[PDB]
Design a protein around this ligand. Structure first.
Ligand SMILES: [K+]
Ligand SMILES: [K+]
Ligand SMILES: [K+]
Length: 343
């Protein structure tokens, strides 16, 4: 019923995104050391049904980042535009030489090749410990949002064409996760205990919510419909994951439905929702990939030990055919779903 396949990409992977139905973008590396381990962007064609590794995972192109660059920490892609969070060498950073840590690439869909376009230093930081925590770009590729680990927490909303900052949002607490609505006109973000919704056009508040259970730690957020977000939280005391749907309208929010979908794990490291808005995928702390059917908020399948440790990102192809996950254990896990699985 499910076809699965695994591949060792050759370096610890920290980001993954599907460029189309069939093509996976992966980013990561061994970091800045003179260690014989590359820092790379890798583009692969995947087909988990085939018999050999070369057929299941075909590498279309690779971009070698600097051997003395940090490993990439975050990526996203939309319509051939690729945005990558990646510190330069710590020495260059520390000695005030500049940190072009937000980089723009182009994937040529016909050439399959990767091109470095331009990069920019947004944080103006001289602390090598600061990294780009979140990188997201809207479906149409017209707006993006990035988030530093640095203090105080700031969300920058930028133009992906030339990497200019549209506006700077000083968030109140630490930004946990982040998502754009499908039209790209709204970005929603979460801290550990609040939801904030902002227009990407004006920078104005649209809606806000802070009355979550005090035992909840908000973890991830994805849009599932035009005016509806899905928030994943973990139990502070106890073990479990709550998925909640919150509707956003006219300055107010309302909880459509809330439900704990499992008690098997303590927390999750990644979440994605398919474009159809029907399926959610979770990557757990204990290294599982879980499939959640959004109509019922029910967990319908768990792939135990899909990586050996640290699952960094999970991504669903636009046709809802493949579920891809990558980890710091150097592995890529591919799941093929039966057609209309969630239905
Ligand atoms: K290296
Ligand atoms: K890194
Ligand atoms: K998200």
């Amino acid at each position: 019923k499910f076809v699965t396949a695994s591949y060792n990409v050759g370096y610890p992977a920290y980001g993954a995104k599907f460029l189309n139905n069939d093509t996976l973008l992966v980013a990561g590396g061994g970091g800045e050391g003179n260690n014989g381990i590359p820092n790379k962007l890798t583009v692969l064609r995947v087909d988990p049904t085939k018999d050999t590794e070369k057929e299941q995972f075909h590498i279309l192109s690779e971009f070698a980042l600097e051997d003395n660059d940090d490993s990439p920490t975050a990526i996203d892609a939309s319509k051939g535009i690729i945005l990558v969070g990646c510190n330069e060498n710590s020495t260059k950073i520390t000695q005030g030489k500049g940190n072009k840590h937000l980089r723009k690439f182009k994937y040529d869909k016909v050439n399959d090749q990767l091109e470095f376009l331009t990069s920019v230093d947004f944080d103006a930081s001289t602390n090598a410990d600061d990294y780009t925590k979140l990188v997201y770009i809207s479906r149409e590729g017209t707006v993006a949002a990035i988030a530093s680990s640095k203090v105080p927490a700031i969300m920058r909303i930028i133009d992906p064409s030339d990497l200019t900052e549209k506006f700077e949002i000083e968030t109140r607490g630490e930004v946990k996760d982040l998502h754009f609505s499908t039209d790209g006109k709204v970005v929603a973000y979460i801290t550990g205990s609040s939801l904030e919704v902002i227009s990407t056009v004006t920078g104005s508040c649209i809606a806000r919510k802070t009355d979550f259970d005090k035992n909840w730690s908000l973890s991830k957020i994805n849009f599932i419909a035009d005016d509806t977000v899905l928030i994943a939280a973990s139990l502070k005391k106890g073990k479990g994951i709550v998925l909640t749907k919150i509707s956003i309208k006219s300055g107010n929010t309302s909880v459509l439905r809330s439900k704990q979908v499992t008690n098997r794990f303590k927390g999750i490291t990644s979440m994605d929702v398919d474009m159809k808005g029907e399926l959610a995928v979770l990557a757990s702390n204990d290294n599982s990939i879980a499939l959640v059917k959004l109509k019922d908020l029910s967990m319908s399948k768990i792939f135990k030990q899909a990586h050996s440790f640290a699952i960094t990102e999970v991504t669903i192809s636009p046709d809802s055919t493949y579920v891809a996950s990558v980890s710091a254990a150097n592995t890529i896990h591919i799941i093929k779903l039966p057609l209309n699985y969630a239905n």
